[PDB]
Design an enzyme around this catalytic site. Sequence first.
Site, PDB file in Angstrom:
ATOM      1  N   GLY A   1      54.038  -2.706   5.264  1.00 27.54           N
ATOM      2  CA  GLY A   1      53.617  -2.789   6.647  1.00 27.54           C
ATOM      3  C   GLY A   1      54.353  -1.835   7.564  1.00 27.54           C
ATOM      4  O   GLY A   1      55.517  -2.064   7.908  1.00 27.54           O
TER       5      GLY A   1
ATOM      6  N   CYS B   1      48.777  -0.024  18.495  1.00 25.10           N
ATOM      7  CA  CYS B   1      50.067  -0.662  18.702  1.00 25.10           C
ATOM      8  C   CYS B   1      51.108   0.369  19.137  1.00 25.10           C
ATOM      9  O   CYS B   1      50.819   1.557  19.303  1.00 25.10           O
ATOM     10  CB  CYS B   1      50.509  -1.399  17.439  1.00 25.10           C
ATOM     11  SG  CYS B   1      49.598  -2.928  17.116  1.00 25.10           S
TER      12      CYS B   1
ATOM     13  N   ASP C   1      65.366  -4.997   5.612  1.00 23.71           N
ATOM     14  CA  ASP C   1      64.271  -4.698   6.524  1.00 23.71           C
ATOM     15  C   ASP C   1      64.641  -3.533   7.428  1.00 23.71           C
ATOM     16  O   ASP C   1      65.738  -3.504   7.996  1.00 23.71           O
ATOM     17  CB  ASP C   1      63.917  -5.925   7.367  1.00 23.71           C
ATOM     18  CG  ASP C   1      62.829  -5.640   8.382  1.00 23.71           C
ATOM     19  OD1 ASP C   1      61.684  -5.363   7.967  1.00 23.71           O
ATOM     20  OD2 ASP C   1      63.118  -5.695   9.596  1.00 23.71           O
ATOM     21  N   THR C   2      63.723  -2.582   7.561  1.00 27.98           N
ATOM     22  CA  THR C   2      63.888  -1.468   8.484  1.00 27.98           C
ATOM     23  C   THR C   2      62.506  -0.937   8.839  1.00 27.98           C
ATOM     24  O   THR C   2      61.504  -1.286   8.210  1.00 27.98           O
ATOM     25  CB  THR C   2      64.761  -0.360   7.888  1.00 27.98           C
ATOM     26  OG1 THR C   2      65.295   0.450   8.942  1.00 27.98           O
ATOM     27  CG2 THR C   2      63.933   0.519   6.982  1.00 27.98           C
TER      28      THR C   2
HETATM   29  O1  LIG Z   1      59.845  -4.236  17.509  1.00 24.34           O
HETATM   30  C1  LIG Z   1      59.095  -4.134  16.538  1.00 24.34           C
HETATM   31  N1  LIG Z   1      58.280  -3.029  16.381  1.00 24.34           N
HETATM   32  C2  LIG Z   1      57.431  -2.832  15.344  1.00 24.34           C
HETATM   33  N2  LIG Z   1      57.258  -3.654  14.343  1.00 24.34           N
HETATM   34  C3  LIG Z   1      58.032  -4.758  14.441  1.00 24.34           C
HETATM   35  C4  LIG Z   1      58.932  -5.066  15.453  1.00 24.34           C
HETATM   36  N3  LIG Z   1      59.543  -6.283  15.207  1.00 24.34           N
HETATM   37  C5  LIG Z   1      59.001  -6.692  14.048  1.00 24.34           C
HETATM   38  N4  LIG Z   1      58.085  -5.806  13.546  1.00 24.34           N
HETATM   39  C6  LIG Z   1      57.321  -5.912  12.287  1.00 24.34           C
HETATM   40  O2  LIG Z   1      56.137  -6.648  12.517  1.00 24.34           O
HETATM   41  C7  LIG Z   1      56.084  -7.785  11.619  1.00 24.34           C
HETATM   42  C8  LIG Z   1      55.354  -8.932  12.273  1.00 24.34           C
HETATM   43  O3  LIG Z   1      53.994  -8.611  12.522  1.00 24.34           O
HETATM   44  P1  LIG Z   1      53.037  -9.643  13.267  1.00 24.34           P
HETATM   45  O4  LIG Z   1      53.022 -10.877  12.392  1.00 24.34           O
HETATM   46  O5  LIG Z   1      51.688  -8.954  13.316  1.00 24.34           O
HETATM   47  O6  LIG Z   1      53.645  -9.809  14.645  1.00 24.34           O
HETATM   48  C9  LIG Z   1      57.541  -8.035  11.264  1.00 24.34           C
HETATM   49  O7  LIG Z   1      57.699  -8.781  10.070  1.00 24.34           O
HETATM   50  C10 LIG Z   1      58.109  -6.624  11.183  1.00 24.34           C
HETATM   51  O8  LIG Z   1      57.785  -6.021   9.938  1.00 24.34           O
END
Ligand SMILES: O=c1[nH]cnc2c1ncn2[C@@H]1O[C@H](COP(=O)(O)O)[C@@H](O)[C@H]1O
Lengths: 460, 460, 460
Positions: free
Chosen positions: B295, B302, B245-246
């Site tokens: 994603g 955002c 993951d990155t």
């Molecule tokens: O600090 C961050 N900034 C941007 N994307 C993030 C961060 N931490 C996690 N993500 C991504 O956002 C996903 C979660 O999206 P959510 O379910 O909409 O909150 C994670 O699985 C990562 O791919």
Amino acid sequence: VRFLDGHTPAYDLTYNDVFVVPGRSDVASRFDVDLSTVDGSGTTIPVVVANMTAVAGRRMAETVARRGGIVVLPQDLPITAVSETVDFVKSRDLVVDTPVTLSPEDSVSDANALLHKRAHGAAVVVFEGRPIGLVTEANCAGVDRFARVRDIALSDFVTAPVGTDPREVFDLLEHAPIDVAVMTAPDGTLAGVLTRTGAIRAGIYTPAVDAKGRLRIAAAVGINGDVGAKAQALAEAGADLLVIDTAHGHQAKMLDAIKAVASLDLGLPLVAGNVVSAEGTRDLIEAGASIVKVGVGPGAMCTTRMMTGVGRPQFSAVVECAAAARQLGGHVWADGGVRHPRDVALALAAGASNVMIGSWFAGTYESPGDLLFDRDDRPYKESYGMASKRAVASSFDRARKGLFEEGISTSRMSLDPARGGVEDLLDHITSGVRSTCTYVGAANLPELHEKVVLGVQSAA
Amino acid sequence: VRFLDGHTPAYDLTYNDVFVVPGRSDVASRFDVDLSTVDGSGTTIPVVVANMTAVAGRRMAETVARRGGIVVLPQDLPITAVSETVDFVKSRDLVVDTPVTLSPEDSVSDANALLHKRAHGAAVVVFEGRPIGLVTEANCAGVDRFARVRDIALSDFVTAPVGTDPREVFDLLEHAPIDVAVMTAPDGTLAGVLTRTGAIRAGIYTPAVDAKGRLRIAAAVGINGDVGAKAQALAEAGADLLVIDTAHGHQAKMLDAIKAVASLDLGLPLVAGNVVSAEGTRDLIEAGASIVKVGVGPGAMCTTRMMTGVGRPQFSAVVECAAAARQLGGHVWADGGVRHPRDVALALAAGASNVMIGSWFAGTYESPGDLLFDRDDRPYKESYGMASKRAVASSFDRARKGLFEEGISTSRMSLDPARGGVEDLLDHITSGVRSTCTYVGAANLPELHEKVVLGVQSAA
Amino acid sequence: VRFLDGHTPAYDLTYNDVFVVPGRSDVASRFDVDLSTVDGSGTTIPVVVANMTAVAGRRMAETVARRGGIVVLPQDLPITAVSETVDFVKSRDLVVDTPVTLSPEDSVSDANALLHKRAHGAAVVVFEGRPIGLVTEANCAGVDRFARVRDIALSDFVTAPVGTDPREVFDLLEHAPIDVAVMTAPDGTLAGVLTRTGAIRAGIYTPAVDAKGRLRIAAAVGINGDVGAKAQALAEAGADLLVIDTAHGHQAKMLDAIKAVASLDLGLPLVAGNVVSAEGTRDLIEAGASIVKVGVGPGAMCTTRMMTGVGRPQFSAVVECAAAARQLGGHVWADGGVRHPRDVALALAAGASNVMIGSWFAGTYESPGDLLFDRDDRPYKESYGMASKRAVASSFDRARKGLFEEGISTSRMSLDPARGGVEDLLDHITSGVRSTCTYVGAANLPELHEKVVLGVQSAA
Ligand SMILES: O=c1[nH]cnc2c1ncn2[C@@H]1O[C@H](COP(=O)(O)O)[C@@H](O)[C@H]1O
Ligand SMILES: O=c1[nH]cnc2c1ncn2[C@@H]1O[C@H](COP(=O)(O)O)[C@@H](O)[C@H]1O
Ligand SMILES: O=c1[nH]cnc2c1ncn2[C@@H]1O[C@H](COP(=O)(O)O)[C@@H](O)[C@H]1O
Ligand SMILES: O=c1[nH]cnc2c1ncn2[C@@H]1O[C@H](COP(=O)(O)O)[C@@H](O)[C@H]1O
Ligand SMILES: O=c1[nH]cnc2c1ncn2[C@@H]1O[C@H](COP(=O)(O)O)[C@@H](O)[C@H]1O
Ligand SMILES: O=c1[nH]cnc2c1ncn2[C@@H]1O[C@H](COP(=O)(O)O)[C@@H](O)[C@H]1O
């Protein structure tokens, strides 16, 4: 339908996405427009009441059918209740309306509560079938709420025999303090009431009647259990129109249900829904249905769209579904999302022969729900969906089903202080639809669909 | 995917831009649909918990995996803690849940705080491994905050041996005042608990298990340092799935990392991300990855989009990455922006094999964060992003790096008073997806992507 | 009365100006104190309900007389309503109370409204005189307000024949879920209800009964018109005590009224008021009255004081008037300003044989007024004065009266959520009065006035 040159957007259209361009017209007056339908429903206005328990009551059935509409009784209503409701509706006068009645021994508290079940603004005090006085909300104000009706009833009222010309009844109420004329049977017993505004509607709206001259009424049936037996007994109860209703009309179980009812040869118009595709519309007609109900998650922000992502904008759905139905000699009903007369006119211009309205009519005196007041003392009533009664279907089994059920959503439907009655909304809707036809140049609903020119507007 | 005729917009589509058009269906029941995945993750449902410290706890892994899900542990978690977490998840019963436990000497303050660690609504008092009573929030109300659990525990409770049919446990709990059945080991020690609703879930959700019947588990790993050593250390720790993951998955340093892990032949599925382009999916699979996580800045407003302008609407990103991955025999995960079951259903329709859910699940009893209350006393938890742990990386050096670091954004995820637990959200999600397939006519997830017909809607 | 040394102020004293100094006491328990009166009223507790239409109903008359008090029916009440009210009270059981009764055809709206007329918390469903069930406020919640009682009535209830001792009935309701026991006649017809709290009061309060063992009741009359003819009609209707009431009791027109009633030799106690002077009290007794009602504008800021400046502090008025009545063998009633049990205790210590309570009892379930709710949804009742019905009395003439007449003042009397029924107020009052005697060392009310030592306090 006709769209302006270049107006072929890369998306589907809601009621908010389209507008009607005026055309050459020789129809000067709104009263020159004929709003009669040609789908076999027998309605003189293109308004159908949705099969929802929050809207489809006995008083709504009488009031809407008298003004040319039709009310579809909700599915799964016990057959004993259907028969009593049909017998009540088909026993009403085509011009005289049924008022709220009170006994001299009833309380003022009941009088104020029971009064707001009609739009007459007055209740008739009855003793041994004879009208003896009228009760108003003013008579209940400032008095003991448990006093008797006899203590506040006004013994003076305008009266006229049943059958009197409504124009003459209109005259008798010109200088009347209470705009209610109590209509009496030959033996002097209560037959109903007629207001000045109600007499006007008698000459504007043609009552939707069956072959025997009785007010029309429809009823719904689900696709679970014995569809043939229920729809058969529903026809025996006196229903003038049968509606087979389910959430996903384009499914084999709905297709089979239509075959079962058609094979009985009941002689009644058959509605089937819901679909939003041309293929689904053709499939329901070939199964034996003559009318198709259109509408699947029309609201982008509604429960169906947000729970499943399944749905379609109602305007584009009707345009596609009506064209498929027209070539097969069928008709389509626009079901869902109607909030203004614009949606009724746009649905008809898109090709629908009738427009089904649900939650909008719940905020009326004639709806079965109780009249409520919010924190600002504004009158309102609660509408709610049929939930699992439109879905395909031991403690474990009930709870297993219970986990995945569709919840019952409740919404605050405010009553318009100037249009509290459903007849006022019918005045609001039909005035717009009639004026719509004058803009396009149509003298009726078929010419509306033929000569309408539509356009697309931006988010502005 | 197939779009409606003419629905080729001049822009990319997010989850709010598309809708699903119903088709002919022979799938009557929601339970007739197979939600199993074909991407090798081992899940029987299309829900993935994101590798976020706000969500990916040990209790979260147990609760989600039992209902068929999989939880990805956050990257950079110490390997000692990874081993402790694996040993918990894979030691759990496939039906019986782990309750909150209490000592007779604990305070009411602790009991009230510890109670909300699960959705059982009751904690079991344990003395030498033996259940001796139950504690509810009602027992904590009105008593001394420093009173002992001994003084408020209810000694009467329903008990049954572990392994008893969950259908039986359900009927045992009807007339029990507390809807918690305490399950016992053969020697009478505590084995776990099972609720009425939890007993029903045993017959609806299939446990996601490995070859030995142990609950499945995932693992995330960053791309800094020795990726091969970290990937091997987590694989030997018991992870059934690996996530590389990155922030910017379409990078050469990323390709080197996937090749390094693939060359180890660990025998486990490799997930790699994140990309939103067709080329990005091709390069990551060519590097050795079997699953491509999709994603990058899905939210227009955002942090990622507002700081760099880089991103892509998630639906258009997934459908393009899904199309590319299919041609190489791979699969894709939709990661980000999911807030409703509609987003899960559209992600599957777009072609994703699994949907990764993070911040939404943070507002659940099973999340590691503390339960907090706002000014209206409503429960919520603080979700937060991973920031630099997804980014590629003297005292002067410390400062300059820290200066430009991406800050941690905090967001309040309110708990639904009717859906406080993550299992309730899984019921909400799967009910919609199962209903979606019935609208489309698909009996499984591959048929969902094959039979789905979509359209575009306006901003109205 | 005895005051502390030096406590001879240069002003008159209200209930807020004085306190009771504890004395040497050998009366341990409140239950050792005898609260019976010796003024000929027949009350076993020193509580009389004022002759006010806001408080003096038949439900109040029955409830107060059963607990040892008496209610004075308001003057000018029609003689037909007198007999109906007296016959109702004289037919009530000395232990069994009269519940709210409902028909199976009554509405839920009426059921909830009628529920609040008693303190039983449940109304008895009656068909042809026989009980079939109860309706509670919980039963009315969540159901249609126009549903029928038959649809919500609970068919299960504890029932016992009339004549069962209250002790055993108390035990039968110990594990009864809803604290209402239905009392039946030997033939199975409804005789009334008895609650656990009502069973307790049966062993605490002695009912005020006439020579035939029927609950006592009094009635008031004005000094206008033919006072003698009215007073005889009230006596013939079954009244146990007569109150000749007027605003200015120390007037010749009042004196002639007493002589007229006295010369009839009706055999009942004669109450006369109102005065606040020793001369006024002595003059009324010489006219033929045996009891003098004391109270003329006792409130410092009330209407009487603000219109005319006429009045006197009630405590000093009672002290002076009682001592004047003592030397003539009479008794005095403390009428006005009662707001707490302290006022009742201080009035008896000052020398009054009875205490009259009006507006305080208006905020009770048993008061005739309807239960109201304010902006905070707190229940309350409106108290209001007798106005011209306590005053000496063509179109031009009638208008002159209204121009200078006293308006009807209204006041919001909130219900105590823990003391909603008037019996709870009697429990609150008698507990303090009995406790007062224990502080003074008195075993009864005569010993209270005999042994009381009083003091004066400052505004602090
Ligand atoms: O600090 C961050 N900034 C941007 N994307 C993030 C961060 N931490 C996690 N993500 C991504 O956002 C996903 C979660 O999206 P959510 O379910 O909409 O909150 C994670 O699985 C990562 O791919
Ligand atoms: O005019 C009326 N008089 C008496 N009862 C009525 C009247 N209108 C409705 N009700 C009662 O109200 C209830 C529900 O009526 P609905 O809402 O019209 O079906 C039933 O108990 C009816 O008998
Ligand atoms: O519970 C429900 N969920 C979703 N749609 C419903 C439900 N009950 C009724 N409907 C549909 O919504 C229509 C009424 O929509 P309305 O006119 O916008 O209130 C009905 O005629 C049905 O087609
Ligand atoms: O069932 C339980 N009983 C007692 N302590 C618990 C329980 N579950 C978690 N904890 C404690 O809660 C803290 C955080 O646990 P976590 O949120 O599951 O990582 C640690 O101190 C745990 O020991
Ligand atoms: O138990 C009861 N059932 C029905 N009506 C009652 C009951 N108690 C009082 N009422 C009504 O209350 C009114 C009389 O008020 P009251 O004189 O304050 O009791 C009349 O309308 C009665 O019918
Ligand atoms: O209209 C009125 N004006 C003045 N005094 C009144 C009126 N009606 C009743 N009263 C007196 O006030 C007493 C009740 O006082 P309360 O107990 O303090 O409310 C009655 O017993 C009467 O003596």
